[PDB]
Enzyme design. Structure first.
Site, PDB file in Angstrom:
ATOM      1  N   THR A 186       0.849  -1.176   0.000  1.00 40.79           N
ATOM      2  CA  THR A 186       0.000   0.000   0.000  1.00 40.79           C
ATOM      3  C   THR A 186       0.881   1.219   0.000  1.00 40.79           C
ATOM      4  OG1 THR A 186      -1.834  -1.112   1.307  1.00 40.79           O
ATOM      5  CG2 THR A 186      -2.043   1.242   0.934  1.00 40.79           C
ATOM      6  N   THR A 187       0.452   2.278  -0.778  1.00 43.93           N
ATOM      7  CA  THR A 187       1.015   3.591  -0.788  1.00 43.93           C
ATOM      8  C   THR A 187      -0.135   4.551  -1.043  1.00 43.93           C
ATOM      9  OG1 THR A 187       2.703   5.084  -1.585  1.00 43.93           O
ATOM     10  CG2 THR A 187       1.998   3.405  -3.237  1.00 43.93           C
TER      11      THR A 187
END
Lengths: 242, 202, 9, 242, 242, 242, 202, 242, 242, 9, 9, 9, 9
Positions: free
Chosen positions: B1-2
């Site tokens: 995730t970003t």
């Protein structure tokens, strides 16, 4: 009426705690005890003549070793004395725990006063109707009386209990600040002798002291007490030929 | 995730990638990564999914109470520092999440980042957060303008995460983006965003 | 007029 | 009749607590304590005549050290006085612990006011009977009075106990704001002789002060008292001629 | 009504807490304090006036800043204010810790009130002796009256204390909401003068205000209080003798 | 009678808890808060004439928002309303917290009845002498009155407070369950006119409603209010010729 | 250890393994991983049998209680969310176990995957949990059509969980399937499930 | 008598608790609820009669569900019923938690009656003043009267509420075990018509029942009462002619 | 009328708390026990007559084991005794835990005196209404009577309860400290005869003793007691001839 | 004398 | 009268 | 005088 | 009459 008096949480319209005021007088009902301060130390004299002959001539005791170099007398309810001195004693050894020091006479009597203050402020507990006199040598003799109020008053000679009123009158004329340890000790027996208004027997009073040479609670046994009581009985005779 | 988050002058576009708790995989075709805190407040998160959802609900409940209670809609700053207090209390419990609170309010538009270590910063207009962040941030700063619009912002948000997706094997397929245009609370949904990333190679 | 007490002022 | 002094939690129809107002008239049963504020210091005078020739020189003693630039005298139950004074100390030392700031006088009076209000609000406890004069130089002289209610009033001369009302009038004529240290000290003795309605001597009072120039608390000794006594008695004699 | 008033748990047969009615008579047993609202801010005045000249009126207060954009005045005991305001000050600031937003005047009012409500709910805890007027500018100017019952009521000009009544009769005639800050300041001054039944002085009034155009608390200096007080005293003179 | 109405932990020979029923007289005096149900929603109307024109009369307000489709209006002591409504506000959101759905009307009402009943059930605390009407559309219109007792009564239309006798007796004759939303609004506005015995002004009145199709609680602005007043006023005057 | 689920238009289908997977042992000679939470609501569990059955009893009890209070059926959604609260308490002291709560309610049907790290994902119509989840996800898309009924939904449910049992043979015998058609709460039993996997042999 | 009813921990010289007797009068105040047990099950019927048509037809709620096979209905304080039944539901749910079995009716009645007794012990907490007739089918049918006194008693047929005295007298004559399931419930309708002293329709009665055959609780809809209501009415008219 | 014995927390104006002096009367209406302490050990003899012959000869009990070297007997409520005897045994053994010393008769006494004083002081609990005799040999036989108040009295030989006063006077003459085990046992037995105002029956009295030379606690066997009792009955008879 | 409208809304 | 409760329903 | 129980003995 | 007798076992 009168009061505003069933509660300790109330100040009467005169602005007194009636409840507490009542407990200084519960002291008087209970036995005589006589404290007397001199330059050579401090003697605490306590009445051990209480009740029938069927009773032991030892009525615990009423002249407790509180610390090593501090002792106290009690007057008032005997029962109230038992728990009050338990806290005193613990606090005197508590002082040593945290400073490792002789507990100052002045300061023990304050924290004693504080136990009785707890019972003045909170509403679920009656004050103790008991008075201790706190006699010892920090490095100079001091004699104090603690009051059910939690008042703390420094004396130079006093009585409490039955003989309070009687003995005050006695010490106006008699007490001197250059009394000898032995003369002072004796003077204390005369004052007890006034309480009962009779000749003292030494087998029914317990006397302890703190000197400023011993710096220790010490206790004068009935065998030793005998001459001091004998010099007292002369002065007590003088009072009762008057 | 970003995750990224853009403050525009017609809206805010916040963005998230799909992945769940299904062995480390998408729950259905979708994964819940969008949390409507309030009517003009959204929550996006880089970090764990479960933590995000459980912690969403506390901020949501309390945000909703703020509106009920004062007869005044919340502001983004209010929710943000509200968030910091909750974390620092709940740090005895297991958690690790970097939190993006944002939306539209009477003071303008803004996105405030809250860290699990402590405070609420105000990230003026630019924010990244994650692990894919280094890549996402590179293309973000050249194609950022302060004069940005919501059309341009959906393109930037997808693109920035997309650059990072090719340096992340931990980024699944599918991006959701969220629009608050101050008249609409839009969710583009798996279908519609897929075309915005199918202007690339997909 | 004494007094209401000075703890009202 | 009435019965809204039966509890501290109960309001009268007269809009007041009559119970707080009898905790006020517990102060008024006790012995006087006086503060005089000058621009050069604050000077606190309190009675120590109490007791016969059987109580100590060094007996209570009213003007307890709270910090190294704060003394506080009391009026009311000496028992209630000690715990408020102890809490008073504790708070003062809390400020120095947590800030390293010698307690602000205004703020000390404020924190004692809140403490005496814990004992007003709850009814499982009883309000204090005691008023303290918190006085010190934090960087200007201040003299405040915290009441049995726990109410803050700022004064530039006051008294608490029985002597108050005589003394209120006396400063209302004589007291000036252009007052300096020497002057203040003589004026407050003058006023203290009115309170006891008789001539002063130095050993039936103890006097504390916090100077601006030292900014330390120093206790007045009997020797320091003497020149103020001599000058003061000139006026004590004139105004007690009836 | 007899005996439905010695406990806070006890409603009358009529239905109304008469215990709370006496705590709302405790408000009227303090001095007058007035707030007057403009569309420019909010002005908060209190009768700072003190009886004997020995007290310093300036340091006696009546009137505290709460937030940095909220001020409050008290009527009721100086004592009960202290707890209430210290609570309010902490509460006002706690919001600025956990939402990073200066507390809304309404919110503050609700929350002070929620605190009071808790102190008039339990049978163990006395009601608050005071009322506050909570006056700030948050988005728009507001001026609230908190009740010892723990109710809040929106006001546009209001008083508490002895003068509540006169002020009511006054502002019913002359209050207008088309006043600006300056007109309002004058009108607010006129009203205090009717309550106290005399002309005011700048040396015996405290005025604090929170402006729209800074949202910052300020205490009017003695210097700048002077002009406003002149035009108002002239009106006050006209009213109280034509 | 007596002494069954000076404790809460009492009963009487009739079964009644008189303390609780005198807390229902506390609701009964001041002031009309009305619910009137329909098949299109539930409509909550309440007065907002309060005090003189010095009070801001365009707020405060009984129509508290509690969720976003659940609303209550209050009657009785407002202080008791503030904590109860807060408790209610929270108990709605506790349901969102733990079940993450809009609370059912029945349940919120059920919960806030159990809270009052807890304050009844333990002594040393009193019941809230406030009443709420709980209005909501979960999916189906419900209108409840939650009692100071802590009892739950469902209605199709009721009113509490000063206006209860008028509006109950009014609806005995008038009400029907076949009313639309608009017709219902007017019929409750006719109900409120009679209660103060005067023609209503949109400004000094307040309406909140929860519609079926919107599923939103809405708080009705005066501008919208006015067309329905126009309809109502002829009806009201006609029946105040009786 | 693995489970599968599919949301149907006329029920909720989920399936479990009878016997736990350790690859040389099982929990007991007869064990159950499908617990009935309420009338039209089941729970299919992955992980320890111990953690899951304890959790099921609490959640069954409170569920019942909510249906009694309301005098109306409760929603699955509320159940799922209660489990999120409960698993946050039991995250302070971790248990690691994955739950699925599904069924029929007044708002429709769905299957909710509730995680010990918090949150609830409403799964649209496809869902699995465990760690054989990625294969399981694949199989489930193969026959899914919006007009798939319950009888065809159990067939698909077997095939999904046969993915794990295909190459880890020992827990291929004894398997359970639960279907829920809104007139029943039917639990097929091993024998009847066994004949459908008789066609897939192994 | 006098002072033996002003608190709950005070026994009277008779060795009664007049307080507890007074909670039974609360049960006699309330709306009637009758329970009748037959060999196949237990039918529990409770007055659903409204104040006016304003109230909702089904006023929430006489007849509670506690388990799936244990139900109960209420008479006496319905405020109290809400808390007391909330506890009851949980205690049976707890037994499905900790033993995964039905709670026996006996044991469910015991645990609930134990919760009452706890609040009779408590002196700061009044007891519940509501009676429930807890009814269910286990190994056999069971019917209990749980008292506000904290006593359980098992009955062949029972009543409580206003109709209590009448239905114990009636059933002395009419009740026997020679009645079927339907014929039991018909007598119970016949009993209910006696309590109210007027004819029945579905709109003043609420029936649930517990069947052996299912071994589950069902709550009977108004629709399926209609034959039984007709049947009952013949008998009721005769009772209202005798 | 009084109110100094409504609760324990009030002192009478005489100074003494009456309610614990009324717990003393509790003892008096209860039934006798005599402890007779000699230098051969200590003896303890206590009632077992009580009630009719519906009761067994061992009406358990008055003769409690407290350790293996300490026994105690009671007069007062045998209810209040039972818990106090539990406390007495646990305390004694705790001394053994935390010191490994057989507790001294004196130190035990002091702790049970402190525990009573817990109850005396707090008003959430009534005094003990029981007196205790603690008789032991630590290394010196010692005998105490513990009062209701928590007070400590040592006796040579003692009584409480019905016969108290007559026994005191019988031992006033005859008892001396020098009387053998055989003499002391028989002497206290004559005295006991008087207490029950009839000849002893050896099955109406239960007797234990703690010896010096064993240092062990032993219960006198029924028939081992019989010749001692025989010689006591002659004397008991003589004195009731007069 | 009022203060009977004032604790109520 | 007019009052009967409400809690005795 | 009075009263020996039962419980006062 | 008795109503408390049936409330003692």
């Amino acid at each position: 009426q009168m009061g505003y008096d069933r509660a300790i949480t109330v100040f009467s319209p005169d602005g007194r705690l009636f409840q507490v005021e009542y407990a200084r007088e519960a002291v008087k009902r209970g036995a005589t005890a006589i404290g007397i301060k001199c330059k050579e130390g401090v003697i605490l004299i306590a009445d051990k003549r209480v009740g029938s002959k069927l009773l032991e001539a030892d009525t615990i005791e009423k002249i407790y070793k509180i610390d090593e170099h501090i002792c106290a007398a009690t007057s008032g309810l005997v029962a109230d004395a038992r728990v009050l001195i338990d806290r005193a004693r613990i606090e005197a050894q508590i002082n040593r725990l945290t400073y490792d020091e002789p507990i100052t006479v002045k300061e023990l009597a304050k924290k004693i006063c504080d136990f009785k203050q707890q019972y003045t402020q909170y509403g679920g507990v009656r004050p103790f109707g008991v008075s201790l006199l706190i006699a010892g040598v920090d490095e100079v003799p001091k004699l104090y009386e603690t009051d059910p109020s939690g008042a703390l008053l420094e004396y130079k000679a006093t009585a409490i209990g039955m003989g309070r009123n009687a003995v005050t009158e006695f010490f106006e004329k008699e007490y001197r600040d250059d009394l000898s340890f032995d003369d002072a000790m004796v003077l204390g027996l005369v004052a007890m002798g006034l309480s009962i208004e009779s000749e003292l027997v030494p087998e029914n009073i317990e006397v302890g002291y703190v000197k400023v040479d011993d710096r220790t609670f010490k206790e004068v046994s009935p065998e030793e007490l005998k001459p001091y009581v004998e010099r007292a009985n002369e002065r007590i005779r003088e009072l009762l030929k008057k | 995730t970003t995750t990224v988050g853009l403050v525009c002058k017609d809206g805010v576009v916040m963005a998230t990638e799909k992945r769940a708790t299904m062995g480390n995989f998408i729950a259905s075709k979708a994964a819940k990564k969008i949390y409507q805190i309030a009517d003009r407040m959204a929550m996006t998160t880089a970090g764990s999914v479960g933590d995000a959802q459980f912690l969403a609900r506390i901020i949501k409940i309390e945000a909703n109470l703020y509106e009920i209670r004062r007869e005044r809609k919340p502001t983004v700053r209010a929710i943000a520092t509200l968030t910091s207090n909750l974390l620092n209390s709940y740090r005895y419990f297991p958690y690790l999440v970097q939190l993006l609170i944002g939306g539209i309010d009477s003071e303008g538009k803004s996105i405030y980042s809250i860290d699990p270590i402590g405070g609420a910063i105000e990230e003026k207009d630019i924010v990244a957060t994650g692990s894919g962040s280094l890549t996402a941030y590179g293309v973000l700063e050249d194609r950022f303008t302060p004069e940005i619009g919501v059309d341009e912002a959906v393109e930037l948000a997808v693109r920035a995460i997309y650059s990072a997706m090719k340096r992340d094997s931990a980024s699944g397929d599918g991006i959701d983006v969220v629009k608050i245009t101050e008249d609409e609370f839009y969710q583009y949904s798996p279908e519609e965003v897929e075309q915005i990333l199918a202007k690339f190679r997909k | 007029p004494d007094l209401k007490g000075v703890m009202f002022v």
